[PDB]
Amino acid sequence: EIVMTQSPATLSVSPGERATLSCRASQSVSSNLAWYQQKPGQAPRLLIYGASTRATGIPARFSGSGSGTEFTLTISSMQSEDFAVYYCHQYNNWWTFGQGTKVEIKRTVAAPSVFIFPPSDEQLKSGTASVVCLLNNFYPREAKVQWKVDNALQSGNSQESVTEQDSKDSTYSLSSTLTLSKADYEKHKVYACEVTHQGLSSPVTKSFNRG
Secondary structure, three states: OOOEEEEOOEEEEOOOOOEEEEEEEOOOOOOOEEEEEEOOOOOOEEEEOOOOOEOOOOOOOEEEEEEOOEEEEEEOOOOOOOOOEEEEEEOOOOOEEOOOEEEEEOOOOEOOEEEEEOOOHHHHHHOOOEEEEEEEEEEOOOOEEEEEEOOEEOOOOEEOOEOOOEOOOOEEEEEEEEEOOOOHHHHOOEEEEEEEOOOOOOOEEEEEEOO
16 A cells, blocks of 8 residues: 655765665655665665664665655765665555665766667668667766657657666666668668767767668
8 A cells, every 4th residue: 555755766976975865655654664775686685674773784874764754865985886776665564665766876977979870781681671879988877869760750669778887987878779671771761860968069960871
């Protein structure tokens, strides 16, 4: 019954900075609340089981506080390894989990390096003509893409995918893929990747065409 919501969805934190995550509940949970840490790939981990009691072995820079319907976890001397995802959990009724909060490295704003890649001959005989937009080592996560063709922004018939942080330098990479049928390659005459990002006063474009 009890829905629990965790805000804000994302926090950008440069190393060594203090971070604050808030958790709210549709109904009261008194103090039957806990905070877990999720490292992608591994298994979630216990951070705080009481409203504030820290479990064994967690660094003292972690601490949570709250009661009733509002709680907040906080970290004061965050290190690089602490960068992960977090969940607030309650057990005062049928227990449930919150959607969670991301935490990412903060770094210098970097404009996206954009490249486009059309199909070629071998795919025609396979009948799966496709194009790729590669955006490399951009920051922050807000960098956004547009597949464009003659009188059409080809979103809804293609897929976006993204790396994790290029953690050795903390940038992001995106490999959007556009896929069409055999005869489609010739049907459309214009093809382009367009990119927007606050390091871009105007959209960045890469393009190709038929003829």
